[PDB]
Amino acid sequence: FMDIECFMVLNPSQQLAIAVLSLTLGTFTVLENLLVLCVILHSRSLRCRPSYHFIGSLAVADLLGSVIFVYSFIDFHVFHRKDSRNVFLFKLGGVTASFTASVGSLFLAAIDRYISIHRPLAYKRIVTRPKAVVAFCLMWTIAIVIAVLPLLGWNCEKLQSVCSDIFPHIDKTYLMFWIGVVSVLLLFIVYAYMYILWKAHSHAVAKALIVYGSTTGNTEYTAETIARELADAGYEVDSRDAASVEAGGLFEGFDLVLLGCSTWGDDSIELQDDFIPLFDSLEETGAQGRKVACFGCGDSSWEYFCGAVDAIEEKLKNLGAEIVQDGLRIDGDPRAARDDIVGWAHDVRGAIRMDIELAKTLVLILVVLIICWGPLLAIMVYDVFGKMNKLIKTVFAFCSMLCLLNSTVNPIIYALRSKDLRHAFRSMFPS
Ligand SMILES: Cc1cc2nc3c(=O)[nH]c(=O)nc-3n(C[C@H](O)[C@H](O)[C@H](O)COP(=O)(O)O)c2cc1C
Ligand SMILES: CC(C)CCC[C@@H](C)[C@H]1CC[C@H]2[C@@H]3CC=C4C[C@@H](O)CC[C@]4(C)[C@H]3CC[C@]12C
């Protein structure tokens, strides 16, 4: 038993600001989605290839949600309308389902693009047109079912219950359940997109592994000269002396692997004593379908010029490691052959990032969702655990406007970014 006017914290100036922000964004949001829906149906008449299952659901939810929200919000605040419990829970159920289905659409958009990254080869087997058709339908029914529950029962007046100080006639247990399901998909949305950016961050920069024997220090100076062209180009480098290497999984996670070794053949071809242990235990090395290249120092005076490079390349192509370019072979000092070093290093780089606008969009969406749903659900958690003062009700009233802004910026985030929709919008014009 709570007074309806107790939920109405309304300063005539605060009432005008509420009305201004809600009638601008409201009329602006409705016109946006009413245009988006018109474009899809116009596009449906011309092209049957774009699914438009996600953008249509998001637009319908934002249109229906905003229309009922702005009207009820202004009627409740500016006009101070006192409705019966069922008539209010009918209206509150309507907006809640629409906004729930809206964020449920973003949840289905998250799983659509999460499966494409986690399981690219199996994406076409899971996400289909009938499955997405059924999923959205069930997403809408569940969204309606949950939001109709307060009207059916499970409210603060039907049961001896502890009520909400921001939503009249609502049981806090129902809100905690509603917050839970909304928070789970939101956290999954945040987790998925954060999982996309961290996964794409490792692929942007390539990793190059350099090992060398070099008793005298020439193949090291070579590798040190080899590494800088790679490093200056933008390659993560992990040069390692062959005397301090671990055999098993030595090449794991390297897009390119450069194996340099000096030849030390007094009588017969012999490699660097430090490079021999790694040579023997190569099978242990990943040694498979790994882009790899060789280099090494030698001298013309010997019958086997850089025979080490030949022995290594024979084991690499034996196990199937793709040798992208021939091994680099140097005699004497590589300080005079610096040009050929950076030449072979730029060539092995030639023979072989991410969409930042799509990467920033995820950042933007995450920043948007954290901005629009963070404080909104936060105030509701304050209502569930303990209670709040009058200022928080006023802040929540302004924060109730914050989710409406999300419905305004969504057709700019997704529909405007749709290359197919913009084609359908231009097709509206003569030719
Ligand atoms: C005992 C001995 C054997 C060598 N055998 C070879 C050989 O078979 N083939 C070759 O090209 N150079 C051979 N060299 C020359 C070295 O490979 C050359 O000095 C090289 O620049 C050494 O590289 P590092 O400074 O990276 O150890 C040999 C040198 C010595 C002292
Ligand atoms: C929210 C309450 C008050 C009324 C909802 C009833 C109507 C408007 C709801 C219930 C079922 C919903 C449909 C369920 C399935 C989809 C597929 C989706 O890809 C586009 C939206 C669309 C076509 C929904 C449009 C809106 C819809 C028809």
Ligand 1 pocket test: pick from 225, 263, 274, 341 the residue with the most ligand atoms within 8 Å of its Cβ: 263
**Atom 28 of ligand 1, residue of closest alpha carbon:** 264
- List Cβ<8 Å contacts ≥24 apart for 64-68: 64/94, 64/98, 65/95, 65/98, 65/99, 65/102, 65/407, 66/25, 66/26, 66/29, 66/30, 66/33, 66/404, 66/407, 67/26, 67/30, 68/94, 68/95, 68/98
Strand 328-331: give its sheet, edge to edge: 235-241, 206-212, 256-260, 292-298, 328-331
CA of 297 to the centre of ligand 1 (A): 7
Query: 63, 34 in Cβ contact below 8 A?
Result: yes
Structure tokens at 379: 């105030």
Rounded distance between C-alpha atoms, residue 176 and residue 380, angstroms: 9
CA of 61 to the centre of ligand 2 (A): 8
Query: 155, 174 in Cβ contact below 8 A?
Result: yes
Where does residue 247 fall: left (phi above 0), alpha (psi -120 to 50 degrees), or beta otherwise?
A: alpha
**Atom 16 of ligand 1, residue of closest alpha carbon:** 298
Hey, is 258 helix, strand or coil?
Answer: strand
Ligand closest to 96 (CA) is 2
**Atom 21 of ligand 2, residue of closest alpha carbon:** 57
CA of 140 to the centre of ligand 2 (A): 6
Structure tokens at 37: 């829906």
Tell me the one-letter amino acid at 426: R
Residue 103, C-beta contacts closer than 8 angstroms, at least 6 positions apart: 182, 185, 186, 373
CA of 218 to the centre of ligand 1 (A): 10
Structure tokens at 232: 């200056």
Name 298's bridge partners.
331
Rounded distance between C-alpha atoms, residue 69 and residue 128, angstroms: 33
Task: Give the binding-site residues of ligand 2, using a 6 Å CB cut-off.
Answer: 53, 56-57, 60, 64, 94, 97-98, 136-137, 140, 144
Atom of ligand 2 nearest to the CA of 97: 1
Q: What is the resolution of this structure in A?
A: 3.0
Rounded distance between C-alpha atoms, residue 334 and residue 156, angstroms: 83
Residue 137, C-beta contacts closer than 8 angstroms, at least 6 positions apart: none
Question: The domain 200-349 is classified under which CATH number: 3.40.50.1370, 3.30.565.10, 3.40.50.360, 3.30.300.170?
Answer: 3.40.50.360
Task: Estimate the share of the chain in helix, then strand, then coil, as percent rounded to the nearest 5.
Answer: 65, 10, 30
Rounded distance between C-alpha atoms, residue 415 and residue 51, angstroms: 13
Rounded distance between C-alpha atoms, residue 170 and residue 96, angstroms: 12
Structure tokens at 247: 């055999």
Tally the residues of the chain: 431
**Atom 5 of ligand 2, residue of closest alpha carbon:** 144
Ligand 1 pocket test: pick from 264, 269, 270, 329 the residue with the most ligand atoms within 8 Å of its Cβ: 264
Task: Give the binding-site residues of ligand 1, using a 6 Å CB cut-off.
Answer: 214-219, 262-266, 269, 297-299, 302, 304-307
Hey, is 58 helix, strand or coil?
Answer: helix
Rounded distance between C-alpha atoms, residue 216 and residue 272, angstroms: 10
Nearest by Cα to 335 from 235, 237, 218, 254? 218
Tell me the one-letter amino acid at 16: L
**Atom 30 of ligand 1, residue of closest alpha carbon:** 264
Rounded distance between C-alpha atoms, residue 92 and residue 69, angstroms: 9
Place of tokens 């839970």: 180
**Atom 8 of ligand 1, residue of closest alpha carbon:** 265
State how far the alpha carbon of 172 is from the alpha carbons of 32, 85, 99, 175, 361, in Å.
Answer: 34, 16, 19, 5, 35
Technique used:
X-ray
Looking at residue 429, the DSSP 8-state letter turns out to be S
Structure tokens at 295: 């280099």
